[PDB]
Design an enzyme around this catalytic site. Structure first.
Site, mmCIF file in Angstrom:
data_model
loop_
_atom_site.group_PDB
_atom_site.id
_atom_site.type_symbol
_atom_site.label_atom_id
_atom_site.label_comp_id
_atom_site.label_asym_id
_atom_site.label_seq_id
_atom_site.Cartn_x
_atom_site.Cartn_y
_atom_site.Cartn_z
ATOM 1 N N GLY A 1 19.693 -24.266 -67.978
ATOM 2 C CA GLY A 1 20.270 -23.588 -66.813
ATOM 3 C C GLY A 1 21.364 -24.437 -66.202
ATOM 4 O O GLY A 1 22.541 -24.090 -66.259
ATOM 5 N N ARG A 2 20.971 -25.575 -65.646
ATOM 6 C CA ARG A 2 21.929 -26.486 -65.015
ATOM 7 C C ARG A 2 22.878 -27.148 -66.027
ATOM 8 O O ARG A 2 24.068 -27.298 -65.742
ATOM 9 C CB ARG A 2 21.222 -27.507 -64.112
ATOM 10 C CG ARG A 2 20.513 -26.846 -62.900
ATOM 11 C CD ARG A 2 19.489 -27.791 -62.293
ATOM 12 N NE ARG A 2 18.259 -27.866 -63.100
ATOM 13 C CZ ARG A 2 17.222 -28.632 -62.797
ATOM 14 N NH1 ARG A 2 17.257 -29.380 -61.686
ATOM 15 N NH2 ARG A 2 16.145 -28.636 -63.595
ATOM 16 N N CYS B 1 18.714 -31.653 -67.973
ATOM 17 C CA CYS B 1 17.996 -31.251 -66.780
ATOM 18 C C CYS B 1 16.615 -30.860 -67.310
ATOM 19 O O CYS B 1 16.378 -30.947 -68.521
ATOM 20 C CB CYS B 1 18.690 -30.065 -66.094
ATOM 21 S SG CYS B 1 18.886 -28.621 -67.142
ATOM 22 N N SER B 2 15.711 -30.444 -66.432
ATOM 23 C CA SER B 2 14.301 -30.241 -66.806
ATOM 24 C C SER B 2 14.112 -29.407 -68.082
ATOM 25 O O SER B 2 13.436 -29.841 -69.006
ATOM 26 C CB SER B 2 13.544 -29.580 -65.644
ATOM 27 O OG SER B 2 13.441 -30.492 -64.572
ATOM 28 N N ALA B 3 14.689 -28.203 -68.111
ATOM 29 C CA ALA B 3 14.575 -27.338 -69.304
ATOM 30 C C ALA B 3 15.728 -27.526 -70.293
ATOM 31 O O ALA B 3 15.611 -27.197 -71.478
ATOM 32 C CB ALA B 3 14.443 -25.856 -68.883
ATOM 33 N N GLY B 4 16.843 -28.074 -69.810
ATOM 34 C CA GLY B 4 18.005 -28.311 -70.630
ATOM 35 C C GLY B 4 18.874 -27.098 -70.897
ATOM 36 O O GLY B 4 19.680 -27.136 -71.801
#
Length: 284
Positions: free
Chosen positions: A224-225, A219-222
């Site tokens: 949280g999700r 995911c974007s930051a790798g």
């Protein structure tokens, strides 16, 4: 010793919840908030990485791959002048090594690095978590030394499954790609059902390899999700095998593997809700 204090907590903290307690007498929303806030981030500082020019390959300044579990690019297929990708190996159920690789979504300048990792690590499944770059092609495209083709695209109610192939020289491999949308950063999915169907989609994926490669989750930051998804799958595995789950322990182990996995108390609470729902589906 803040480092030793952090590591000791993460290696020893736990809050086992039986299937009954999870469903009927879970910790209160306040207790879960306080518990989440107590979990150390295990973020690595820029000083703890001596990888020059790594910053140009990071989406975020303070979200960095812990050195101990960092995926290093050997460059067997390329002439690229470093080993760096913002990605970590993640342990699975019962501490099984290299079950996942958690990484940020590729940047325009790290798409080739991403496919190099997929090749080097013998990845056959990628799980992408997003809300409404395109590093896979419409039909066929070359990324560095790799040729990528899409064989099939199937739209499911809550995710899109693409069947891709990646080829280097004579060798071509299959890669299943699952894109789960409607999951904004710092938030939870709309409900737990779609997430549990995503976890099932992953389980049901045929494993061809003799020693299966890591499942890439991004995911974007790798953190949280990706952390929510991996914690959900490990929690389900614990419930199915043992009839109890230690969610606090799961998150602590994830943070040992990659700093900051699961970003918000609301995500942590949603993990409890999700696993309580999964418990209802088990035998008996």
């Amino acid at each position: 010793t803040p480092r030793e204090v952090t590591l000791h907590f993460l290696r020893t903290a736990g809050h086992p919840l039986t299937r009954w307690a999870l469903q009927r007498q879970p910790p209160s929303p306040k207790q879960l908030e306080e518990e989440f806030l107590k979990i150390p981030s295990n973020f690595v500082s820029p000083e703890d990485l001596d990888i020059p020019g790594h910053a140009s390959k990071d989406r975020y300044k303070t979200i960095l791959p812990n050195p101990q579990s960092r995926v290093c690019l050997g460059r067997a297929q390329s002439q690229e002048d470093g080993d760096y990708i913002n990605a970590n190996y993640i342990r699975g159920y019962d501490g099984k090594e290299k079950v996942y690789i958690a990484t940020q979504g590729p940047m325009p300048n790290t798409v080739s690095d991403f496919w190099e990792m997929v090749w080097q690590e013998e990845v056959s499944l990628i799980v992408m978590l997003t809300q409404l770059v395109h590093y896979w092609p419409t039909e066929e495209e070359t990324y560095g030394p790799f040729q990528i083709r899409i064989q099939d695209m199937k739209e499911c109610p809550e995710y899109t499954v693409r069947q891709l192939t990646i080829q280097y020289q004579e060798e071509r491999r299959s890669v299943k790609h699952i894109l789960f949308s409607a999951w904004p950063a710092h938030q939870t999915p709309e409900s737990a059902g779609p997430l549990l169907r995503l976890v099932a989609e992953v389980e049901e994926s045929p494993e061809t390899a003799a020693h299966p490669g890591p499942i890439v989750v991004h995911c974007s930051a790798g953190i949280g999700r990706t952390g929510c998804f991996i914690a959900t799958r490990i929690g389900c595995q614990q419930l199915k095998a043992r009839g109890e789950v230690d969610i606090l322990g799961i998150v602590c182990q994830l943070r040992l593997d990659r700093g900051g996995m699961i970003q918000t108390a609301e995500q942590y609470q949603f993990l409890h809700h999700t696993l309580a729902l999964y418990a209802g589906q088990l035998p008996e």
